[PDB]
Amino acid sequence: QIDKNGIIKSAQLHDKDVGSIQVQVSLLTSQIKQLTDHLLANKKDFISKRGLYAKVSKRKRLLKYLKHNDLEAYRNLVKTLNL
Amino acid sequence: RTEKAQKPKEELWDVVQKMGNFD
Amino acid sequence: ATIAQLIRKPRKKKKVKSKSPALHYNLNLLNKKVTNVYSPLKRGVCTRVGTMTPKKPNSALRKYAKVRLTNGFEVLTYIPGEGHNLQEHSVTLLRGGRVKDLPGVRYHIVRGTLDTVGVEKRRQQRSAYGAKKPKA
Amino acid sequence: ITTTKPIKAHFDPVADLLTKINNARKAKLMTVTTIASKLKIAILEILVKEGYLANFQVLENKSKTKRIVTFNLKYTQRRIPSINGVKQISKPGLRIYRPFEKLPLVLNGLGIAIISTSDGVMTDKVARLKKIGGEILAYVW
RNA sequence: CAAGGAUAGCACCGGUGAUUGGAGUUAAGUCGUAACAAGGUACCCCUACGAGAACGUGGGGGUGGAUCA
RNA sequence: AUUGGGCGUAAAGCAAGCGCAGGCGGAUUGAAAAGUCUGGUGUUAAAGGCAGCUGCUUAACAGUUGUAUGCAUUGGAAACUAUUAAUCUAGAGUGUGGUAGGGAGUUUUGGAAUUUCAUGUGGAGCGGUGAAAUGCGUAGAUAUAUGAAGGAACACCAGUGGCGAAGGCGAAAACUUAGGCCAUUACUGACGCUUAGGCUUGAAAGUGUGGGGAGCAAAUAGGAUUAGAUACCCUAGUAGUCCACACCGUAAACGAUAGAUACUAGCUGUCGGGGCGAUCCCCUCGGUAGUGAAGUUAACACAUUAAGUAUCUCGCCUGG
RNA sequence: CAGCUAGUUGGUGGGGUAACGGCCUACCAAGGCAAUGACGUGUAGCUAUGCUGAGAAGUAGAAUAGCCACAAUGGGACUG
């Protein structure tokens, strides 16, 4: 379904990042992957594609912030803003 | 939690009142 | 609407349909730079003269004249003079105004000027009609 | 005490204050809560002193964690508010400022505009007298 | 060196021209009244065709129709 | 229509969702002070004008003085913004736990039966309308029941229901999963907001592509009727309605009411969630509704889901 | 009117008008402007001065004072 708790806790480095930028962007990226899988398995689900584009946009804005605030976001960039 | 009470008085109970003396 | 959008969608003033531009400009050889003088009464050669019917409530056999100005635009006009002194070729100087009765007509003509003078026997419209001084 | 109905960042403190003020005027409501700020505290104190607005109480949870202000309008004993119209001037989309010599008296020479300047926040008359100008926060009459 | 003079290819803009769509205008032009009552078939919106035409019918979108609690 | 206007029916909200150019931003504090004020100088011309005078008979006119007027160069201020240096959550939200929608798609069948074929019987009608007729029936009908096949779409449940971005979602069954409702000082610490451009989707006709096509109707064609039917009647009837692909990408996609955001008498209903407890009543919040206060449209009316209140952004709007 | 621009773009050296200036060149080069719509396009002579209105703003910079441009169009040189 949501694929929520496991991905959060994998991105949950400490007890001080339950809702941080890191876990949020990880959730959006994991949701992008899961939505691609689903919508390839379920073609005409336009809800999934519109949500995928919305998550892509919100991920872009989250990344622009994460590079505005912390300069170490792109030195270990496993979340490059290209999709 | 109280920080500052600038004139803690507050108006209340606006009765229907007008021209109290008519006698 | 709002100022932020108003910058991108500025104010759009009211527009008016053609009334009488041709009276103000005309062409000429040797530099076709237009005659930007805003002529109040501009000479031109008339083409047709006749009489026809205005609208239904106010019908008549009222005079009309298809006239041609120096510039490209030629137009059908009304003669505000008592009787018509235009003979389908008379040079005449035009006027402003608009006629709401005769179709095809949206103009008035200077009655009395360098041409179309002397209607005669007048108390009103002697500055117009070119009528002379009111000698007893 | 217990201050109920907190408000979060709407888009700005000024519009958050204006919507509450107009809603109180509409529903004949007494006291409403909005955000807290140094400018808001200054204008609220000066409006208590001016008489257009009744008192206010600024409240905090523990820190910048949550800072709000509850404010009441001065009402006669007829449910008639003292506020006869307040217009916000300082806005996010339009930062409005005026010199000390270009500040008018509102209403009919009675209304008092609230003006923050280079060295403080005050009323329109003493802003003209101060020979120092700045942004305007609210036209009050 | 040069104002300038050139070639074949091209390019931009204007008017014209057998023939001609469309618009306002004649209280007094041709058919039937489609349609305005649920208006003589309820209206239509998007789209296919045809019909002098009002228009008529298809597949979907709606009541910007009445009935009626 | 900044000054100095609308977007429900007399312009109208983008067809729907997401986004940049660009625009603006929650709280505290410090740098800097562009914005902001402030202190000044230069110049912004005499002629021109504001105030003033003179003479031309008097101004017309001519002369004339204090004054205009925009840049640069100059001490500051921290109130905030555009910027910077940090933090705090409360906006974006995220976490947790409870947590529902005919959500979409995918994958299946099941039936009312539609049509057809064989089994048959039946022994002159069926059919259609306002009226008949056209059409169908005697290679055996009307009709009937079985068996078999192919297509289409799913009786009731269907909601002052929920969800989906609009488009929409209803025979059931499963899966992937968008998203939702309830309460979280819970976590980054504004990460925000929209949206011209830009990205994606987008009823449907109808286009061709491969099947079957069950049925029918655009077109077409006969009998009516008509002043005439390819209109209203029907029969025959194709494209199409069916599906796979694109494109068509428009709709009464209009609530002719934009998206994000926060607030405004109530009242009577419903659904979902949280707590609780025979049920229940009840409270909480939303969703889904309304009369109506206030407020707002000329008016019609909306009205806690506004056309009420206000911020950021965009689209639409000036006579036929 | 969405792409336009090959001194385009800048450098060393040399030459150069009154001179700095790719001003121009030998040599070395591939960059410059631009959706805040680049390039192109044609036009107006720009400021003071010219009117209307309270204001917003609009209306010419004809001629004029300053500057600027041709002075029949396009070059060259000389003088000063």
D82 three-state secondary structure: coil
Residue with tokens 């007048």: C122
d(C-alpha D46, C-alpha D106), whole Å: 16
**CB of C4 within 8 Å of any CB in chain D?**
yes
* Structure-block tokens of residue C71: 């510039």
Beta bridge partners of D136: D115
DSSP-derived pairing of the beta strands C44-52 and C62-69: antiparallel
Query: Which positions on chain E have an atom < 7 Å from some protein CB?
Result: 24-28
Chain centroid to CA C75? 8
Residues 1-23 in B contacting D (C-alpha not used; CB under 8 Å): 1-12, 14-18
- Residue C41 CB burial class (10 angstroms; 0-12, 13-18, ≥19): middle
E-only strand ranges, chain D = 31-35, 53-60, 67-73, 86-88, 97-98, 112-117, 120-123, 134-140
Q: Which of C101, C94, C97 is nearest to C42 (CA)?
A: C94
Contact D92, D11 (CB under 8 A): yes
What residues of D are in contact with residue B18 (Cβ under 8 Å)? 78
d(C-alpha C77, C-alpha C74), whole Å: 10
Region of A3 on the Ramachandran plot (φ > 0 left; ψ -120 to 50 alpha; else beta): left
Contact D24, D44 (CB under 8 A): no
The parent domain of residue A44 ranges over 1-83
State how far residue C80 is from chain D, nearest Cα, in angstroms: 55
Interface of D with C (CB under 8 A): 93-94
Say yes or no for a CB contact (<8 Å) between B6 and D76: no
- At D78, the amino acid letter reads R
Contact D82, D21 (CB under 8 A): no
Nucleotide nearest to C60 (CA to C1'): E27
State how far residue B17 is from chain D, nearest Cα, in angstroms: 6
Give the chain D residue whose CA is nearest to the CA of C5.
Answer: D93
d(C-alpha D21, C-alpha D31), whole Å: 9
Indicate yes or no: strand F within 7 A of the C-beta of C6.
yes
- Residue A71 CB burial class (10 angstroms; 0-12, 13-18, ≥19): exposed
- At A49, the amino acid letter reads K
The CA angle D3-D68-A62, to the nearest 5 degrees, is 125
Q: Which of D29, D28, D30, D77 is nearest to B17 (CA)?
A: D77
d(C-alpha C66, C-alpha A19), whole Å: 82
d(C-alpha D56, C-alpha D18), whole Å: 15
d(C-alpha A75, C-alpha D87), whole Å: 49
Q: Could you give the number of structural domains in chain A?
A: 1
D17 three-state secondary structure: helix
- Report CA(D129)–C1'(F225) in Å, whole number: 96
Residues making up chain A, counted from first to last: 83
